[PDB]
């Protein structure tokens, strides 16, 4: 019958491994080129007559 | 006597004007490529025996 096939594999190349850099919540923040702060916001106002 | 000399001047070239971009406290923050946050800090600990 149909069984799960698994192809033979060569050792892992270090260049394929990106995972060490984003496996934790903090790391996902370390990963942003820039973090969002309150002073970056500009709120629009529609002033009336 | 010695009086303050002032050389004749040509109109201002727009390319010389950088001042419009950092004349206010907020602008000096807008000017940073990256702002400092608490999550960017890593504190070293010397653990004893």
Q: CA separation (Å) from B22 to B10, B12, B26, B32, B34?
A: 25, 19, 8, 11, 16
- Residues 6 or more apart in contact with residue A29 via CB below 8 angstroms: A35, B39
SS (H, E, C) chain B: CCCCCCCCCCCCCHHHCCHHHCCCHHHHHHCCCCCCCHHHCCCCCCCCC
The answer, for B34 touching chain A at a CB cutoff of 8 Å, is yes
- Residues 6 or more apart in contact with residue B29 via CB below 8 angstroms: A39, B35
Q: Using an 8 Å Cβ cutoff, are B25 and B31 in contact?
A: no
Give the resolution in Å.
2.2
Q: Nearest by CB to A26, from B30, B35, B39: name it.
A: B39
- Residues 6 or more apart in contact with residue A34 via CB below 8 angstroms: B34
Closest Cα of chain B to A1: distance in Å?
54
């Amino acid at each position: 019958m149909h069984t799960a096939e698994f192809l033979e594999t060569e050792p892992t190349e270090i260049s394929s491994v990106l995972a060490g850099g984003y496996n934790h919540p903090l790391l996902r923040q370390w990963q942003s080129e820039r973090q969002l702060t309150k002073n970056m916001l500009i709120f629009p106002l529609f002033i009336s007559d």
